[PDB]
Structure formats: C-alpha cells, structure tokens
Nucleic acid binder design. Sequence first.
DNA 1: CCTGACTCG
DNA 2: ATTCGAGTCAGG
Length: 580
Amino acid sequence: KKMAFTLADRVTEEMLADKAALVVEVVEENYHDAPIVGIAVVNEHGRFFLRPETALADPQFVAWLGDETKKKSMFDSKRAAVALKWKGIELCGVSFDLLLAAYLLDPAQGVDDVAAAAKMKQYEAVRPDEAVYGKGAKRAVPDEPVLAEHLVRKAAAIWELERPFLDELRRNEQDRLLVELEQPLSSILAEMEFAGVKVDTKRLEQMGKELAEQLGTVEQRIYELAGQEFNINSPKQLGVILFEKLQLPVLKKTKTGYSTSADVLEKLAPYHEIVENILHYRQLGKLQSTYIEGLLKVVRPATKKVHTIFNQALTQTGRLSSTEPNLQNIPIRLEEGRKIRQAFVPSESDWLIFAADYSQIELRVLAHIAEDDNLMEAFRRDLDIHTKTAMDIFQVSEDEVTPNMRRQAKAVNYGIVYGISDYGLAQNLNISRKEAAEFIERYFESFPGVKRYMENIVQEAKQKGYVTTLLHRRRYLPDITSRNFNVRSFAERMAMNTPIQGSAADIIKKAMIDLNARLKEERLQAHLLLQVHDELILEAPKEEMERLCRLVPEVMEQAVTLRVPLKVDYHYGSTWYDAK
DNA sequence: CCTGACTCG
DNA sequence: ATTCGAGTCAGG
Ligand SMILES: Nc1ncnc2c1ncn2[C@H]1CC[C@@H](COP(=O)(O)OP(=O)(O)OP(=O)(O)O)O1
Ligand SMILES: OC[C@H]1O[C@@](CO)(O[C@H]2O[C@H](CO)[C@@H](O)[C@H](O)[C@H]2O)[C@@H](O)[C@@H]1O
Ligand SMILES: [Zn+2]
Ligand SMILES: [Zn+2]
C-alpha cells in the first residue's frame, strides 16, 4: 500500500503506449449519459491519472482511445465504451476485460468491482469501490487525490491481473470463450444499448388512461364482492379478506403468512368469484405501474428512446439480463398486455421491426447433448413437441391446440427435462399426482436418452464439482454433495438445467457475433436492437426485409453445428407488436 | 430494505 | 420443500 503515480494535467506521449490498462470511471450505476469523473492509465512507462476535461478534449488521447492497434486492458469496458459514446468518443482496441474474465472463471463470486476480481488472486493493493465512494445517499466522488489514487490502483491491478486470469482461463479451456465470444459480444451489446429503442409515447399514454379506468372498475367490483374496501395490492390485507373474512381454504402458507400466489388463487376459483377478479386486477396493475409508468419514467423525452443495460456478467448460466428498463420481459402472453408492444417502433421513417426466434431451442440443444434418438428423430422429422405434448395433455387434435395450451405444454416439456417432481407437475396442471407420475414415467419411456443423460450429468457434477456448456462456460455446484436433501436436490437440478440453458445462451451469443459480421459484410443498414434469450430483434429499411428473411435465419441456424438442425421462426412489421 | 406479486425466456 | 434463469413494483 504505497503506489507511485503521476497526477498529470496534460497528455504526454508516454501515456499513449500500444499496451495499457485503462480506467474511465463512471460512478453512476446507470452509465447512460453519465459523467466520467476521472481517467487512469498504467503502462510500461508509468502510472498516470488524467482529469476527464483534459484527456477527452485532447485529440491525441482521443485518437489513442479510438485506435484498434493500441491495446487496452479494462474492467467493464462496455460501461466505458457507452459512457464514451455519449460524449461522442469511440473506444477500440480492448483486448482484455477483467469483469468478463472473472465472470467466466466463476459466476457465483458476483464480482462487480476490481477489488472483488483482485481477490480471486489474493491481490490486495486496491480498495472496493463502495469503500471509496460510500453507499446510498452518501455516495459521492471523493477528493481528487483520494480519487486519483483509487483509479490508479484499479488500473495497476488490471495490469498485474491480466496474465494470471488469462492463465487460469487457458487451463479451463475458456480463453477463446473470453476472447472470441464474450469480448466481441460486449462491443455489440454496447452498440445496441447506445442505439436504443424508439417508443410511441402518445400510444403508451393513451393505454395508461384506458388502463386506469378499467382498473377503477375492477377495483370496485372487488370491493363489492368482498363486502369491504381494502388494499388489493397488499398480500397481507388480501389474505385476511380471503382466508379470515371469506373463510376460503388455506392451500399454502409462507414464512410471512397466507399465500395469495396466482397458483393458489387459481385453485380457489371454485369457491368464490372474487379470486378471478383479483388475478385480473393484479395483471392490470402491473401493466400500469411497470409497463406504462415505469417505461415512461425512463424514456428520453427528446429522442423518445429507451436505453436498457444488458448485464453481461450476472446470470449463473451465461444468459444476459436487461435492466432499467428490463426489455426482456415486455408482456406478450395475454392480449391486453401484448398491446404494450405496439408502442415499440422503428427509429427511422419507413423502417420496420424484424424479429427472429429459435424454435424449441433448449429441446434441440438437449437432443444434441443427450443424444436421444427419439428426440433427435422427432426433430429431423420437424415435429412440434410443444404442440404434440399439448395434444397429449388436453387430449386434443393438432388443430384444437390454442397458442395458450402450447405455452402450457412448453412449461411441461421443460419442467420434466429439468426435473419437475410428480407434485409440481400435478400442481402445475391441477391434475392427480399419480397421473402426474405416470405422465413423467411415460415421458422418460419415450426419451430414455434424456433419462440416461440427466442421471449422468448429476454423477459428473458430483465428481467434478462443476458442470459445463458447449462453449466451456462453467458453473460450480458445491452443494451437490450436501447431506441435506433440499439443498442437494437444488444442486442436482442446476446440473440438469445449466448445461442446456447455458449452451442455448452460448449459441445465441455466437449467433449475434456472426450476424453482426454478415450484416456489415453485405452493407445492410439493418441493426440489432434487442436480445431476449432466444430471440433477436432488429430494425431496418423496408427494402431490406427480403434479404433479412434469408440472412438472419441462416446465420442463427448455422452459428453452431449440432446433431440436429436449429429452426428459426421470423416475422416483421411496423411495430414490435406486429412482428408476429 | 425484504417479500411476494407480476412480467418474460 | 418439491422444473430452471431473470427484473420491477407496491406494501410493509
Ligand atoms: N417454463 C420454462 N421452464 C424452463 N425453461 C424455460 C421455460 N420457458 C422457456 N424456457 C427456456 C427454454 C426455452 C427458452 C426459450 O423460450 P421459448 O418460449 O422461445 O421456448 P422454445 O424456443 O422451446 O419455444 P418456441 O418453439 O415457441 O420459440 O427459454
Ligand atoms: O456495467 C454493468 C456492470 O456493472 C455492475 C457492477 O459493476 O453492476 C452495476 O451496474 C448495473 C447496470 O447499471 C446495475 O444493475 C448494478 O446494480 C450495478 O452494480 C456489474 O454487475 C455489471 O456487469
Ligand atoms: Zn424459442
Ligand atoms: Zn423466444
């Protein structure tokens, strides 16, 4: 803890070496249009702190920032890249991202600052961010010298930690996972975030008014049915009305009291019609609070765009998440909610929304991985297993399978492969438990390869202490040897699920990198706006739709070669709603 | 601040 | 207790 560094006030030539650790500090969690509070560089010639106003106004520094041949090592380069994009500066030449490296080594660590990454190698010459900026309403940039030393320490850590992290990734066979997948993807995500998605706010505001009226109506119906006014949004007050005043049966309690989950309420529908109204009220209330009001709070008023942040270093399986706002959970399953999507529109005149989605994605992945002949046979024959299972569950013909039953069948197919118990299945479909068990038994009968697989991967997990995906992403499962049934069971189902969802996440990630290449290749103007786990959403000039219809599905289907083909459904239209 | 509700994959 | 992976919100 005694680090020499230059508190510079002008950019020098020795600050612009072709290999360096770089820190461009954004203290605001949401980095969109956020202030950059300081800059630090460590390279073969020394350690430098630069004030942003100086460095960013200097053509020589900016030129360096922009130069691909000049290699930078950073922590969370996407944060830097975007916060720079907002200041009109380009960042290139990022050859190592310590956030992504640490996330690949172990997602459970929840590394979200340099100090946490440093710890993985017992490097302690740097402090946690929170310790320097403080927490909550106390959060503040500290005095220049103190700030300066912190940024410099972070760059020095990055500088020291590159080789050792690359070393361990190399051992794990994750070196290409970092350098060829996560890092390139990071630039693509940065472009998507910066571009944003345009919102029809007049539409959103109109729906909000209508929603408020209907909410008022349902609310009053509920008080009438209840004989009393109460806070329907209080599971606590509600449970009193349901289970104490109306005396409905108690199907379930949690640590806090009576459960009023949708699952429970749906089961109580035979006893009292108030329950259906409550379910409807909470659906509508969510639409209004979150997808009208929340969405309107974060739209940028002059451009009418929303700029999400895709957290690339968060999920245990390798999936992305989306925050502030979450654009991966926009309603679709109920017609009333789905209309929210009419407000998501192209950013240019005469452009349209194109959307492409992997069909049955994880089932295809599992079929490749488990090498089940029946499943792989079902797929080379292009059956729709969701519809099929649906036909089975509701005892109906292909044509009597509504989009809604197909969604139920989907959770059942995935539920079973991912280790749902007879209880959960019976509870899910409100059917008999003995029936549930037999249905499962029958499922494994039908796909014994999948049955062998799930048994094997749990054994493997027990011996190795972790599982892996197609592209060698890894998840550690220490609890898999736990003496506790509950704890151990959770780990075992993680071992069943992670390799498949993680592989699917690997696949779409590679698909995105390839697609970006093929786009820029053919000089198409089309660009990615969103990823939603197994779908990609683009906007593009209407003329391009013809090209896209061949290109996007090809790229997505050929991103990897599996024992079975991949299938991509696609559609386009004037709004996200219409791309169906 | 946590829980339990809703939303999606 | 009892498929898996996420985020946001009101209420408490
Ligand atoms: N209920 C669920 N349980 C576990 N995993 C799920 C569930 N629903 C979705 N997933 C995971 C598995 C499939 C992946 C993509 O979701 P999606 O709704 O597009 O399923 P799918 O690709 O099998 O069906 P579709 O042919 O309609 O696109 O997300
Ligand atoms: O740039 C996102 C990156 O930052 C981390 C921690 O450094 O998370 C921060 O930023 C997120 C996006 O704004 C916030 O949701 C999060 O709460 C905040 O800590 C990483 O988790 C993430 O990869
Ligand atoms: Zn799909
Ligand atoms: Zn999808």
